[PDB]
Amino acid sequence: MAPLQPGDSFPANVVFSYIPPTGSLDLTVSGRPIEYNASEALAKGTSVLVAVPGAFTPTCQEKHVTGFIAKLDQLRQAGVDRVLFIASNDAFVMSAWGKANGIKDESILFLSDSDTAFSSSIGWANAGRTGRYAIVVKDGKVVYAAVDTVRGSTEKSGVDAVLTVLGN
Amino acid sequence: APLQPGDSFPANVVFSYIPPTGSLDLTVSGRPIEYNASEALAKGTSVLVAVPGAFTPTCQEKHVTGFIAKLDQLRQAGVDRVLFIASNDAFVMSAWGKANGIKDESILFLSDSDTAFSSSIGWANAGRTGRYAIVVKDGKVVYAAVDTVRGSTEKSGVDAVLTVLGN
């Protein structure tokens, strides 16, 4: 299928699995997963959805999520209402990944694209992992969608690319 | 082939893992290598525990924590190495070990990539390993058992392993 383009509607009926943040960073509490209605959340306001190949893996952790965390204030000033990080890791691993990064609240949500269903549906999954990509949505419409295919690069899906889009 | 007491531990069993560096900081990822489990298990007393998933409720809150709480007793019972495996990748397994305060070789946290080993002994399910424990002495299986009851560590928990070792 053709990748998402600016002006496309964000796909309907997209649901992720996640553990909402409790405020505790205690990694030894597994938590309770529920679902997240991504299509509904993205229908209003400005959203940034970032997919990473794997929680805790080197680029995803040391460059990609850390870049977003470092510029959360700039994202908020740019009008972003929600930031979602997804991967194929299960909700328990994703919750731990957020806690390991000090995220106690909803500033970034960490969710599972179970079995890569959503990422596969938009052509950006590989053998059980999602690609590395970012989608910016406003009021249910794609503003930007791009995937990084160069190993270790966040040129297209990193926080700076997203901030550039929002400033234009 | 279901492993049972008296069998040789299978050959060519290799896991993927990040050897512990001493770090307890989950934000540093590490470099994975392979672990030759068949060779490590050929000498001494080994406990190999498989869990369905790093960070999941029973695996975290009951199974690995039970083993950590009684590492002193496992040592005194003659255990030379404890290995925890799951289908999660080596980066997740390393983070899971660090989340439990393990910074050395007291318990190693390794990936059974694609459930290769667990499938070969009949104890894997839909991309996850089963919950099981294998005790090995000098290359020979002395105990091998799987828990199939949801939330149970009756057969693969530390108390079952300590009982095995005491008999």
GROMACS .gro file of C-alpha atoms in nm:
model
  335
    1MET     CA    1   0.000   0.000   0.000
    2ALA     CA    2   0.107   0.357  -0.066
    3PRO     CA    3   0.261   0.524   0.239
    4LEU     CA    4   0.061   0.790   0.416
    5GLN     CA    5   0.083   1.130   0.247
    6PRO     CA    6   0.014   1.482   0.378
    7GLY     CA    7  -0.357   1.541   0.347
    8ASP     CA    8  -0.457   1.178   0.396
    9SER     CA    9  -0.692   1.092   0.678
   10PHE     CA   10  -0.527   0.906   0.963
   11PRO     CA   11  -0.651   0.545   0.928
   12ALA     CA   12  -0.970   0.444   1.103
   13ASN     CA   13  -1.003   0.196   1.388
   14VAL     CA   14  -0.639   0.203   1.505
   15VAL     CA   15  -0.601   0.070   1.860
   16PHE     CA   16  -0.283   0.013   2.062
   17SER     CA   17  -0.218  -0.175   2.389
   18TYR     CA   18  -0.066   0.017   2.677
   19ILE     CA   19  -0.031   0.067   3.050
   20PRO     CA   20  -0.131   0.425   3.140
   21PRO     CA   21   0.120   0.599   3.365
   22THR     CA   22   0.046   0.589   3.738
   23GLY     CA   23   0.312   0.842   3.838
   24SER     CA   24   0.542   0.576   3.981
   25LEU     CA   25   0.872   0.496   3.815
   26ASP     CA   26   0.896   0.163   4.002
   27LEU     CA   27   1.011  -0.082   3.734
   28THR     CA   28   0.923  -0.384   3.949
   29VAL     CA   29   0.548  -0.311   3.924
   30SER     CA   30   0.432  -0.473   3.601
   31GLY     CA   31   0.105  -0.277   3.566
   32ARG     CA   32  -0.231  -0.341   3.399
   33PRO     CA   33  -0.265  -0.306   3.019
   34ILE     CA   34  -0.570  -0.158   2.848
   35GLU     CA   35  -0.633  -0.035   2.495
   36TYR     CA   36  -0.582   0.311   2.346
   37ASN     CA   37  -0.809   0.441   2.072
   38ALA     CA   38  -0.548   0.613   1.857
   39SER     CA   39  -0.782   0.710   1.574
   40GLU     CA   40  -1.014   0.885   1.820
   41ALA     CA   41  -0.729   1.053   2.010
   42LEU     CA   42  -0.583   1.184   1.683
   43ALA     CA   43  -0.919   1.318   1.558
   44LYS     CA   44  -0.875   1.647   1.747
   45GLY     CA   45  -0.568   1.857   1.812
   46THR     CA   46  -0.208   1.797   1.710
   47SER     CA   47  -0.048   1.460   1.765
   48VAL     CA   48   0.297   1.315   1.705
   49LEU     CA   49   0.314   0.935   1.665
   50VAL     CA   50   0.665   0.790   1.660
   51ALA     CA   51   0.740   0.423   1.595
   52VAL     CA   52   1.072   0.266   1.695
   53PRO     CA   53   1.209  -0.076   1.601
   54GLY     CA   54   1.264  -0.169   1.964
   55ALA     CA   55   1.237  -0.051   2.319
   56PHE     CA   56   1.578  -0.041   2.488
   57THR     CA   57   1.772  -0.085   2.163
   58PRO     CA   58   2.063   0.149   2.094
   59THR     CA   59   1.934   0.406   1.844
   60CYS     CA   60   1.578   0.398   1.979
   61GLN     CA   61   1.693   0.466   2.335
   62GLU     CA   62   2.014   0.665   2.310
   63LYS     CA   63   1.915   0.895   2.022
   64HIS     CA   64   1.548   0.876   1.928
   65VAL     CA   65   1.337   0.883   2.245
   66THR     CA   66   1.596   1.090   2.429
   67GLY     CA   67   1.577   1.357   2.160
   68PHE     CA   68   1.201   1.385   2.203
   69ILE     CA   69   1.230   1.398   2.582
   70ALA     CA   70   1.491   1.675   2.565
   71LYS     CA   71   1.264   1.895   2.350
   72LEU     CA   72   0.926   1.831   2.514
   73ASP     CA   73   0.894   2.201   2.600
   74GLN     CA   74   0.958   2.299   2.238
   75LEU     CA   75   0.696   2.047   2.123
   76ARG     CA   76   0.441   2.189   2.366
   77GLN     CA   77   0.519   2.544   2.252
   78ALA     CA   78   0.468   2.424   1.894
   79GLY     CA   79   0.114   2.318   1.982
   80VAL     CA   80   0.157   1.943   2.022
   81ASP     CA   81  -0.122   1.797   2.236
   82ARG     CA   82   0.008   1.440   2.260
   83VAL     CA   83   0.322   1.241   2.181
   84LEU     CA   84   0.290   0.865   2.135
   85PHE     CA   85   0.582   0.622   2.107
   86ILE     CA   86   0.495   0.278   1.968
   87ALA     CA   87   0.689  -0.041   1.903
   88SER     CA   88   0.612  -0.409   1.868
   89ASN     CA   89   0.729  -0.476   2.223
   90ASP     CA   90   0.440  -0.563   2.452
   91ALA     CA   91   0.274  -0.313   2.681
   92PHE     CA   92   0.471  -0.428   2.986
   93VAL     CA   93   0.806  -0.370   2.815
   94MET     CA   94   0.688  -0.037   2.674
   95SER     CA   95   0.575   0.078   3.019
   96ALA     CA   96   0.914  -0.017   3.162
   97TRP     CA   97   1.088   0.171   2.880
   98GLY     CA   98   0.898   0.488   2.966
   99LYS     CA   99   0.979   0.449   3.337
  100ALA     CA  100   1.346   0.393   3.257
  101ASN     CA  101   1.336   0.729   3.080
  102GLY     CA  102   1.182   0.905   3.379
  103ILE     CA  103   0.842   0.966   3.220
  104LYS     CA  104   0.584   0.966   3.502
  105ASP     CA  105   0.291   1.134   3.325
  106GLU     CA  106   0.125   1.162   2.983
  107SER     CA  107   0.394   1.387   2.826
  108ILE     CA  108   0.490   1.084   2.615
  109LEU     CA  109   0.278   0.768   2.610
  110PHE     CA  110   0.451   0.434   2.544
  111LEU     CA  111   0.229   0.183   2.365
  112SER     CA  112   0.246  -0.149   2.182
  113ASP     CA  113   0.156  -0.190   1.815
  114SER     CA  114   0.065  -0.550   1.878
  115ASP     CA  115   0.201  -0.785   1.613
  116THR     CA  116   0.298  -0.472   1.413
  117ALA     CA  117  -0.064  -0.452   1.291
  118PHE     CA  118  -0.082  -0.075   1.244
  119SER     CA  119   0.273  -0.036   1.113
  120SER     CA  120   0.218  -0.323   0.869
  121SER     CA  121  -0.110  -0.165   0.755
  122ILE     CA  122   0.083   0.143   0.641
  123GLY     CA  123   0.372  -0.057   0.490
  124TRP     CA  124   0.632   0.032   0.755
  125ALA     CA  125   0.706  -0.289   0.944
  126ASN     CA  126   0.983  -0.548   0.910
  127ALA     CA  127   0.977  -0.908   1.039
  128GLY     CA  128   0.808  -0.851   1.373
  129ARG     CA  129   0.934  -0.497   1.440
  130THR     CA  130   0.790  -0.166   1.333
  131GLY     CA  131   0.999   0.066   1.123
  132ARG     CA  132   1.144   0.389   1.259
  133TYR     CA  133   0.896   0.657   1.156
  134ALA     CA  134   0.708   0.966   1.261
  135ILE     CA  135   0.356   1.079   1.175
  136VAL     CA  136   0.229   1.427   1.262
  137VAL     CA  137  -0.151   1.456   1.265
  138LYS     CA  138  -0.382   1.757   1.306
  139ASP     CA  139  -0.756   1.708   1.350
  140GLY     CA  140  -0.750   1.362   1.197
  141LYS     CA  141  -0.540   1.457   0.892
  142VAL     CA  142  -0.179   1.361   0.825
  143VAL     CA  143   0.052   1.663   0.816
  144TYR     CA  144   0.376   1.463   0.777
  145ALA     CA  145   0.469   1.097   0.760
  146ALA     CA  146   0.822   0.970   0.701
  147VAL     CA  147   1.032   0.661   0.769
  148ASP     CA  148   1.406   0.636   0.833
  149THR     CA  149   1.572   0.354   0.639
  150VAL     CA  150   1.938   0.447   0.704
  151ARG     CA  151   2.072   0.253   1.001
  152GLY     CA  152   2.104   0.469   1.311
  153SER     CA  153   1.948   0.774   1.149
  154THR     CA  154   1.671   0.987   1.289
  155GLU     CA  155   1.683   1.233   1.001
  156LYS     CA  156   1.318   1.182   0.903
  157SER     CA  157   1.160   1.062   1.230
  158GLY     CA  158   1.357   1.255   1.494
  159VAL     CA  159   1.233   1.542   1.703
  160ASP     CA  160   1.408   1.803   1.486
  161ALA     CA  161   1.227   1.682   1.174
  162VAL     CA  162   0.898   1.703   1.362
  163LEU     CA  163   0.971   2.053   1.495
  164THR     CA  164   1.063   2.167   1.144
  165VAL     CA  165   0.730   2.041   1.010
  166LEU     CA  166   0.538   2.215   1.288
  167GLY     CA  167   0.717   2.544   1.221
  168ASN     CA  168   0.623   2.525   0.853
  169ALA     CA  169   1.155  -3.406   2.229
  170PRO     CA  170   1.058  -3.352   2.596
  171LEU     CA  171   1.370  -3.331   2.811
  172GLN     CA  172   1.367  -3.551   3.119
  173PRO     CA  173   1.604  -3.648   3.401
  174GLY     CA  174   1.893  -3.854   3.271
  175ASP     CA  175   1.904  -3.698   2.926
  176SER     CA  176   2.215  -3.517   2.813
  177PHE     CA  177   2.153  -3.146   2.785
  178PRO     CA  178   2.110  -3.077   2.411
  179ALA     CA  179   2.406  -2.969   2.201
  180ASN     CA  180   2.435  -2.644   2.004
  181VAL     CA  181   2.216  -2.439   2.239
  182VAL     CA  182   2.310  -2.073   2.193
  183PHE     CA  183   2.140  -1.764   2.341
  184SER     CA  184   2.190  -1.392   2.272
  185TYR     CA  185   2.281  -1.168   2.562
  186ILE     CA  186   2.467  -0.860   2.684
  187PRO     CA  187   2.729  -0.969   2.940
  188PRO     CA  188   2.679  -0.762   3.256
  189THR     CA  189   2.908  -0.460   3.265
  190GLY     CA  190   2.827  -0.351   3.619
  191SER     CA  191   2.579  -0.088   3.505
  192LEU     CA  192   2.237  -0.058   3.667
  193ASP     CA  193   2.137   0.226   3.432
  194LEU     CA  194   1.866   0.104   3.196
  195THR     CA  195   1.929   0.391   2.951
  196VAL     CA  196   2.255   0.237   2.829
  197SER     CA  197   2.180  -0.039   2.582
  198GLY     CA  198   2.491  -0.260   2.563
  199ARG     CA  199   2.650  -0.487   2.299
  200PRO     CA  200   2.493  -0.835   2.247
  201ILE     CA  201   2.700  -1.146   2.189
  202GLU     CA  202   2.619  -1.516   2.194
  203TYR     CA  203   2.626  -1.748   2.495
  204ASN     CA  204   2.717  -2.113   2.444
  205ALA     CA  205   2.476  -2.269   2.690
  206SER     CA  206   2.561  -2.628   2.597
  207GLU     CA  207   2.927  -2.566   2.683
  208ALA     CA  208   2.861  -2.371   3.004
  209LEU     CA  209   2.627  -2.646   3.126
  210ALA     CA  210   2.879  -2.925   3.056
  211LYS     CA  211   3.049  -2.874   3.394
  212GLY     CA  212   2.909  -2.788   3.734
  213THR     CA  213   2.552  -2.731   3.845
  214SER     CA  214   2.334  -2.499   3.636
  215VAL     CA  215   1.977  -2.373   3.671
  216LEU     CA  216   1.811  -2.262   3.347
  217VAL     CA  217   1.476  -2.084   3.387
  218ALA     CA  218   1.253  -1.975   3.100
  219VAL     CA  219   0.984  -1.711   3.148
  220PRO     CA  220   0.710  -1.610   2.905
  221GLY     CA  221   0.808  -1.245   2.918
  222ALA     CA  222   1.045  -0.994   3.071
  223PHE     CA  223   0.853  -0.740   3.284
  224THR     CA  224   0.526  -0.934   3.273
  225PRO     CA  225   0.334  -0.987   3.600
  226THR     CA  226   0.416  -1.341   3.711
  227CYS     CA  227   0.763  -1.342   3.558
  228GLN     CA  228   0.860  -1.020   3.737
  229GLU     CA  229   0.657  -1.014   4.057
  230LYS     CA  230   0.691  -1.381   4.155
  231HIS     CA  231   0.932  -1.580   3.940
  232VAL     CA  232   1.257  -1.388   3.902
  233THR     CA  233   1.213  -1.216   4.238
  234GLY     CA  234   1.183  -1.552   4.411
  235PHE     CA  235   1.515  -1.661   4.263
  236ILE     CA  236   1.686  -1.334   4.359
  237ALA     CA  237   1.559  -1.357   4.717
  238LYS     CA  238   1.717  -1.702   4.758
  239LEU     CA  239   2.045  -1.669   4.566
  240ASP     CA  240   2.228  -1.734   4.894
  241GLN     CA  241   2.050  -2.069   4.927
  242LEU     CA  242   2.118  -2.161   4.563
  243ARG     CA  243   2.488  -2.089   4.615
  244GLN     CA  244   2.496  -2.295   4.936
  245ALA     CA  245   2.323  -2.576   4.744
  246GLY     CA  246   2.612  -2.580   4.496
  247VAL     CA  247   2.463  -2.389   4.202
  248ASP     CA  248   2.737  -2.247   3.980
  249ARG     CA  249   2.520  -2.049   3.739
  250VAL     CA  250   2.160  -1.931   3.704
  251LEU     CA  251   2.029  -1.839   3.360
  252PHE     CA  252   1.698  -1.667   3.289
  253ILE     CA  253   1.583  -1.685   2.926
  254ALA     CA  254   1.284  -1.547   2.735
  255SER     CA  255   1.199  -1.464   2.378
  256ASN     CA  256   1.256  -1.093   2.444
  257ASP     CA  257   1.570  -0.963   2.273
  258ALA     CA  258   1.900  -0.921   2.452
  259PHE     CA  259   1.850  -0.548   2.506
  260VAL     CA  260   1.516  -0.601   2.684
  261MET     CA  261   1.660  -0.891   2.885
  262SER     CA  262   1.956  -0.680   2.997
  263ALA     CA  263   1.719  -0.400   3.103
  264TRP     CA  264   1.506  -0.651   3.292
  265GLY     CA  265   1.810  -0.779   3.483
  266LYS     CA  266   1.915  -0.427   3.570
  267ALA     CA  267   1.560  -0.339   3.680
  268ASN     CA  268   1.599  -0.621   3.933
  269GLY     CA  269   1.932  -0.488   4.060
  270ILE     CA  270   2.147  -0.756   3.898
  271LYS     CA  271   2.481  -0.614   3.784
  272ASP     CA  272   2.696  -0.930   3.774
  273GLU     CA  273   2.689  -1.298   3.679
  274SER     CA  274   2.473  -1.408   3.976
  275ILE     CA  275   2.184  -1.440   3.728
  276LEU     CA  276   2.237  -1.398   3.353
  277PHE     CA  277   1.949  -1.266   3.141
  278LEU     CA  278   1.951  -1.403   2.786
  279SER     CA  279   1.733  -1.427   2.477
  280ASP     CA  280   1.613  -1.757   2.333
  281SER     CA  281   1.598  -1.599   1.989
  282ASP     CA  282   1.276  -1.693   1.806
  283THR     CA  283   1.210  -1.947   2.084
  284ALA     CA  284   1.455  -2.178   1.904
  285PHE     CA  285   1.566  -2.375   2.209
  286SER     CA  286   1.230  -2.374   2.386
  287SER     CA  287   1.051  -2.492   2.072
  288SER     CA  288   1.306  -2.771   2.026
  289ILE     CA  289   1.208  -2.915   2.366
  290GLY     CA  290   0.834  -2.862   2.314
  291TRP     CA  291   0.790  -2.575   2.562
  292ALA     CA  292   0.713  -2.265   2.356
  293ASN     CA  293   0.388  -2.096   2.254
  294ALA     CA  294   0.321  -1.832   1.987
  295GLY     CA  295   0.653  -1.649   2.004
  296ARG     CA  296   0.705  -1.684   2.379
  297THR     CA  297   0.883  -1.952   2.572
  298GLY     CA  298   0.696  -2.151   2.831
  299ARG     CA  299   0.758  -2.107   3.203
  300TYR     CA  300   0.998  -2.385   3.293
  301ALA     CA  301   1.309  -2.483   3.487
  302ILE     CA  302   1.592  -2.721   3.396
  303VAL     CA  303   1.858  -2.823   3.648
  304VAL     CA  304   2.177  -2.964   3.494
  305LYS     CA  305   2.484  -3.123   3.654
  306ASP     CA  306   2.795  -3.191   3.442
  307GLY     CA  307   2.597  -3.191   3.118
  308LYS     CA  308   2.314  -3.418   3.239
  309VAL     CA  309   1.958  -3.308   3.307
  310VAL     CA  310   1.856  -3.381   3.666
  311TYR     CA  311   1.521  -3.194   3.660
  312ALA     CA  312   1.304  -3.045   3.387
  313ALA     CA  313   0.953  -2.920   3.442
  314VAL     CA  314   0.704  -2.672   3.297
  315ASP     CA  315   0.429  -2.474   3.466
  316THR     CA  316   0.105  -2.469   3.266
  317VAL     CA  317  -0.126  -2.325   3.535
  318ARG     CA  318  -0.169  -1.948   3.493
  319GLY     CA  319   0.040  -1.758   3.746
  320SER     CA  320   0.195  -2.069   3.898
  321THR     CA  321   0.562  -2.125   3.977
  322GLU     CA  322   0.498  -2.462   4.143
  323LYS     CA  323   0.730  -2.653   3.907
  324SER     CA  324   0.971  -2.384   3.784
  325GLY     CA  325   1.004  -2.163   4.091
  326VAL     CA  326   1.305  -2.136   4.316
  327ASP     CA  327   1.150  -2.353   4.588
  328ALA     CA  328   1.102  -2.640   4.343
  329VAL     CA  329   1.463  -2.605   4.231
  330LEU     CA  330   1.593  -2.595   4.589
  331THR     CA  331   1.393  -2.909   4.672
  332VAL     CA  332   1.543  -3.083   4.368
  333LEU     CA  333   1.891  -2.982   4.482
  334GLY     CA  334   1.832  -3.100   4.840
  335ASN     CA  335   1.730  -3.444   4.716
   0.00000   0.00000   0.00000
